[PDB]
Design a protein around this nucleic acid. Sequence first.
DNA 1: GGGAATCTCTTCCAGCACACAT
RNA 2: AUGUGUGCU
DNA 3: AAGAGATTCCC
Lengths: 93, 78, 284, 113, 326, 1083
Amino acid sequence: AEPGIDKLFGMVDSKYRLTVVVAKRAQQLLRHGFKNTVLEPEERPKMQTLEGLFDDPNAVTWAMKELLTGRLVFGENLVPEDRLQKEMERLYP
Amino acid sequence: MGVTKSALSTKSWLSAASFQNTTHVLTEAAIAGKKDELIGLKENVILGRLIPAGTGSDFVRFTQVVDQKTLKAIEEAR
Amino acid sequence: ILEAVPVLPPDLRPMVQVDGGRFATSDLNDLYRRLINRNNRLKKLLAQGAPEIIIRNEKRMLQEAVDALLDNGRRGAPVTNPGSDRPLRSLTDILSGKQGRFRQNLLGKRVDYSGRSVIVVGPQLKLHQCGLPKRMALELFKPFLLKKMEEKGIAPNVKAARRMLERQRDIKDEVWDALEEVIHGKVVLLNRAPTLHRLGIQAFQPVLVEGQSIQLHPLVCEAFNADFDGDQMAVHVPLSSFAQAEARIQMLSAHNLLSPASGEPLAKPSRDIILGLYYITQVR
Amino acid sequence: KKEVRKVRIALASPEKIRSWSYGEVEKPETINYRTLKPERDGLFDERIFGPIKDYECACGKYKRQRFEGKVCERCGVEVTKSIVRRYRMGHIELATPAAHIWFVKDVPSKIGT
Amino acid sequence: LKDLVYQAFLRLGMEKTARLLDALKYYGFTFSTTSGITIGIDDAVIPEEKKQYLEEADRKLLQIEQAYEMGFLTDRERYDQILQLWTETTEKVTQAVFKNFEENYPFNPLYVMAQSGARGNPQQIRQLCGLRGLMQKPSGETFEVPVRSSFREGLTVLEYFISSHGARKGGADTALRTADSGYLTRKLVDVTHEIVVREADCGTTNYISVPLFQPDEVTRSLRLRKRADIEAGLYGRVLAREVEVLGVRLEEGRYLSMDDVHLLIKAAEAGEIQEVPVRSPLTCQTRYGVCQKCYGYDLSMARPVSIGEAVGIVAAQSIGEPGTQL
Amino acid sequence: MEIKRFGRIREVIPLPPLTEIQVESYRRALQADVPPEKRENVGIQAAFRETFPIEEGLVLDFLEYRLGEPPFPQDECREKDLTYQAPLYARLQLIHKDTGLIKEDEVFLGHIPLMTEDGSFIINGADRVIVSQIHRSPGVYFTPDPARPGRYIASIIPLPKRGPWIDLEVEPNGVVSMKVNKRKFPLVLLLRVLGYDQETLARELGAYGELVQGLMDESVFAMRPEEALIRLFTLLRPGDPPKRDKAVAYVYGLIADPRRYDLGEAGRYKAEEKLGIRLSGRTLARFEDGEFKDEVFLPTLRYLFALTAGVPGHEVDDIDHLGNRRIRTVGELMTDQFRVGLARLARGVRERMLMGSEDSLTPAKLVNSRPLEAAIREFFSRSQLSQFKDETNPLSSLRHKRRISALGPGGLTRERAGFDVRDVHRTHYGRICPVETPEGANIGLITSLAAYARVDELGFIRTPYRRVVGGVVTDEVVYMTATEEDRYTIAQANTPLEGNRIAAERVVARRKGEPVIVSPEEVEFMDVSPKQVFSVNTNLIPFLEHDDANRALMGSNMQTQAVPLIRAQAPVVMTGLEERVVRDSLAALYAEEDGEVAKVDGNRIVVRYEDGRLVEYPLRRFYRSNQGTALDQRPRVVVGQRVRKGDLLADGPASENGFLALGQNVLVAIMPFDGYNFEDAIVISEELLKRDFYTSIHIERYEIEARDTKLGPERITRDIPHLSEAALRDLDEEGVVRIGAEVKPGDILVGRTSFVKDTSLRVPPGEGGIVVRTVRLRRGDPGVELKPGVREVVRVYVAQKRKLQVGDKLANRHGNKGVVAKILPVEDMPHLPDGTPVDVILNPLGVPSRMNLGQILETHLGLAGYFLGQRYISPIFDGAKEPEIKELLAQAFEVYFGKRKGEGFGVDKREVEVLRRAEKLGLVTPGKTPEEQLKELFLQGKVVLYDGRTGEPIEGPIVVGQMFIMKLYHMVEDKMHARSTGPYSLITQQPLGGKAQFGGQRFGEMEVWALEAYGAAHTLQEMLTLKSDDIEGRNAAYEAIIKGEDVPEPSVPESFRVLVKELQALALDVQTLDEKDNPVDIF
DNA sequence: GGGAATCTCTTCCAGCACACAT
RNA sequence: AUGUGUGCU
DNA sequence: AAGAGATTCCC
Ligand SMILES: [Mg+2]
Ligand SMILES: [Zn+2]
Ligand SMILES: [Zn+2]
């Protein structure tokens, strides 16, 4: 099993929608610094050697645990193509 | 018509170029400006492009996701 | 009727040194060779003299020499001088055939990051996961492990980490712990011998298990019809974060609990399980 | 033009045949045994096809990336990696027209019909 | 167990069913080893009435045989006679194998396996304790002398030989078709790779009526369609017009769960509806592809089929997988 | 140790020398034994005179032939890539039409492979063997007509391929059609050729069925003596009517086209014994004065009418009655190829008469050395029929020779016709095993010969049958043919007998191949022993009568791949064939003559023959098998002991004191255990490793060649140009690594360089091990082949001993395969009340669905075997039964329990609990004392067992006992793949190579459809390009992961942009339009 | 102008292995 | 790199 | 190699 996937599949129209959402989320979450997360204070994924999952082990786990809360919104067209790419690299390292 | 007889004559020449006699599927389709509608999987796989289904479906392929921290920044100069 | 002959790009026809000094050139260079030989012999010819036999015979030779380049095997069979009676692989052959550019991706291609071994029952693990021997986990996930070895005090830089795993006795605790930190949520694809239906390849989370055989969960056997009597299975790693994302969502075993063919559970209790349950739930 | 949608095939005119070509293979020359460099404007010449090397040109007037899309003043060498070598086509101007055996030899003669 | 996993799948979810399944896999093992279930030579308890089921058979044929020698029945007829005798006899002894357990040895290590979903088979257990039947000759005919012995007791030399005939045939019937596993999925893929569910709904309203009655079992007699068949023709489909039957009104264009079909058959028994209107790929408007409503349910789970699924390949495979079983 | 036999059917005759089909056939296939003037015309010699007098002035003649002394010995050919052949001399003279007689004896016109005393031929430095072949025997036959079950057709097969295929059919109209080659014509005309009057014909055929009116006629058509020839030629060979037909006479005559199968053997005996009456000469020709004569034709006609009419003694042939299908043995294959070559030689001598100068030309002008060489060389190395000798264990090697294959030269069996041919016909009984057929595809097309069965020159299989005098059994063994067997009533070997007299009013028997119960008078023959039904492997399976035919097959087929264990035990329950198997398979070494022992070394055994002779015996320790296993001969007698003639002195790779040791005897408890024995998986005790139980020795042979290139002469030296001395620490010899060194995946085995970069030989990603032998064939080589261009070869034998690890494949004789799942330590393993733990745990769920209760019994007897320390011999169908096993168990129980009851211990509380539950179960009898309850349980093979990891007794008694389990030839280290990124190829970018990586896994259409059906487009495309062929993106990802970034996707599909170019090479144009039709760049 | 016969071209199947051969 | 053969699935 | 389709020849 995975972090509440039934909530995730129901969360979208098609099952593939969820996959693309999660994927792209992970991508931007890794490319523009792992800081642009939407649940980093206390309710966040952790690991077992140290609690150091707080930085950058897995990309997808984060995306799935994030979507679980109403912090992100998917959809067809939301933001202009280039502008998004620009500002998402500006606001973060 | 039979299943193999069916698939023997798909419009998309890209597909028939693999199974059927290639030199023929190309010679015959060349004389008539045949638009290969890149839709069939087998057809669209010979090239490399993501298969037109699942995570590659147009209905899903073009989707974005953002948070409010960026949504606001974009919201301003809109 | 083409009066200009399009020549293929270089590397698509590699004139390459092999070993000792052997040179493998794709037969295409050899074909393009005689083409120029006749062509130039034709253009220069029209300048000096112009005999009918000479020039006409020349035209025929050209028309044939270009056909050789296009579709070899329709008129005799142009051969490299006594050493190999084989016909030179023409441009037409570079496409048509089992090993061409049409039947190419459809059925072939050997994957890179991968492996295989003998399947074994995997009692002490869940559907979500599978048992994959240490050596494999290390080899398959080599570069990830390199970078994570750099992130910590396991190796100075990338190269030092590359040399760090060179000999088989270097694998210390640090490297293994790192190797656990390089997977966590990552999943691998396990492939059956004859792949038949959709549920013929599943995604499991790798567990670093000792032994040398792939450990596989009991319940997902009847899916891709596997028994433990010599069977083998292959393994891949969906590298891209996108590939990972889709793999652990739509290709993960615990998510595919019903057969696309019919609304029946295909991960139902099988042999031993049912026995054990039936034994305790009957009256005397 | 950023999204490839569908793909059409058709016969190509002499002009179109030459449109993809960046020069004429006016020699049957491949590679010298001594210098593995290309020969006499034949099948491997950088002028028509591409720079045998990476980003470096023929002689060496321009040698790095800073001037990525520039041609050398004295010899024609525009440079990406050895990819522009493997991507660019050249051609051959036959003295006498010749027909495509594909359209000649076929179960239905594409020309005899 | 299977039905339970299915119901719990649609009631508690998918991720939950995972945990449930693994719990079963655990406890089931753990108890399968405490149980002390094992196969001993005695475990294959042979029916007590064996000798009599044979006796009454022998003393039967003794008469029948004589009827031939006098000139009553013909060659064909007696050939069929021996057939009926032994076919009835074997099937009769089977009942003895399975009943003797249920009466005097309820938890028989060989019986609990064959009874539950463990390894075991009715006519197979009939061979360990009861006797093997008549064997197939090398031709389409059968030996008039059945292997009158069981695998537990000494199966005699000659019997083994008249058994090997069919024994080797089996190997052909399986191992030859082990190569044909990539043939039908192949031919079916070549034409179905273009089909995919990339639409929400189509502008059409064409359906078909799946027969809940079979007109052709006897010469021409209409009756209840097979329990199994109907389920595969209605499960997870979409109606074309609202239909009320047992008392509840089935929504128009609704994704039918299995129970929908259940009460539909229970309604068909009382003579309510004869057929059911249903959307199908057979009548989709989408040139290349099928729409969500027209396809139906299946999505490795009981959910509305996701928009974008490669249903062509999936179906071709679904038809290809059990091709080798035929 | 010791034994207790059970078999009570007195084996009247010992089993034949198992390897005779390969040996005797070959010995008879050449006159190298007896002088060139003696008998035995057949074989090579025959082949001579069939194409020897090549009359044209050209008349050669068979003036004796001799060879036999090989270039190089048995072992030396194995080390130096050679053949155990012999230079073919043969004495050959020429006689011209005119005067003058020039002769020149010996001509090196080729070589010829000999055979070891075991049955193989070392070809090209590799032990190979040519199996036998079954095929329809050339002769006259009568089978039903395809479309009409009313009339029948005749058939006259004559091998080889060149040679007609005659069929006689009575056309429904009435006329009888002669079918020659394929074409048809009035047969009456050919009847007229031979000189048949309408009257005599009317007589002979008219005899019965009126059907003669269909042929006898042709008044206007058959009123011409010699003209039938001239007319036949016109109607058969479109051309000119002179004497060409009178010459074709010979073609459907003798010498040429028709079969040269002697006057008496194949054609004769088959024809007569089946149909017709007479054969006058090899085939149909007698031409005293140009005229014709015939014998086979007219009986053929006669028998045809007989069948298509009344009942002149039931005339029906069965296509695959086996009494119609010969068996080309090895010598027949060899001799046939020899004939084929001789023919080509004769074509050469036919050609050369034109290139002659004067008269004499016997030696160097006519007879050449290319045809014969072509015949004999190609065969022993290209024939589908000759293969690698399967030498996993001695038994395997033995079986491989005793096998019969249908697949052959194609003129007899194809590979697109089966299902019906594969079926066990009736006459395979005693002749061919109805079990041995290798499962999987190609099943039925291969069948091993039965035990006692043997070929009788003529080809057909004969079975040993004990005839009987009315009521009493005769001690005469008649070997009957399949066709002769039907003509009798034979009883089974289980029938009760008083010394030699029948003692049962009703006797089980079998008439023309069917179960019939008769009286002691109608018995005429009797099967020797039930052991004659099955091939030897099946006969190495105890309690077979309690196994399914399907399981028994696997059981019989498992032994062929049983790896020779260093400490291999004999089966605790065996059949008796073991002792015979080791000796007949030439596994171990025995004594040749009585005497005492001189010197028992680990390399020799010297024997004290009374005749003042001590003959030297080698005892060879580590000789690499053809498969990879290791063959070791270890001594079994101590110095100062008197041995007898025919007694063992040493053991083979798979023997224990003379018994076929193909595995281990392990105390098995059959019960489910957690999930570890799920499906067919097997649980195993750690103890089995602590005492080297399942340990093998595999010797991997590596090699390198020294090709002398012109761009740079390669050579082997102790020099590796670039980096370390540490890697050269093992390099002892000047170029060769030391013997006894430890090599590991990546370690340097050989040192050599080419044009200077290192191109040496290192140890593959698999595993090295410990070096045992280093063979080096240099330039100054005292008589070797050596590959062209190569100067010298360096072969290294790297051995290693492998223990039983999780993942290895284990199985038994009854046919239960199963890979090892877990090796639980001794403490947490199910153990008896005695301190003794169990070795192997086998799931009971594997039993009922396969109906092989053989394991169950082997285990049962195995219990008593364990506690009495005495193995057993239980013959196939006359071995041990329930009462005997149970009775022995009662005996062992007294040891196992008397020890405790005596020592000061009694019934454990746990035992009592288990008994209490067993009462409710139904096993024990309610009432008895706990001791007697335990007795009742022990009788049933079952015994109280403790969980081991808890102490809690397993509630419910489980059957335990030692069974025979063998480690199969598969291992896991032999098959282990795990490479992420390594070498590729210059010609194809798809990843494979064995430097530091194994090789990339194959990703077929089956897998691609799976990915597509999942809809995992990203993964799939990533799989087809990024990780396979797309070089441009491969390095992208490889650079991405190193830095830690996400894997970049391929923007422009590589295999697409390349296809664009490959398509633009022609006059074709691939336009990549946009969404609304507009050109789009790709580069 | 149609029908039949003959010749030529194309299809040619699930996975890994180990072999050898060309 | 293709064919033959066998082994396992 | 076997089967299917196309082409050519004869009626
Ligand atoms: Mg299996
Ligand atoms: Zn320059
Ligand atoms: Zn639709």
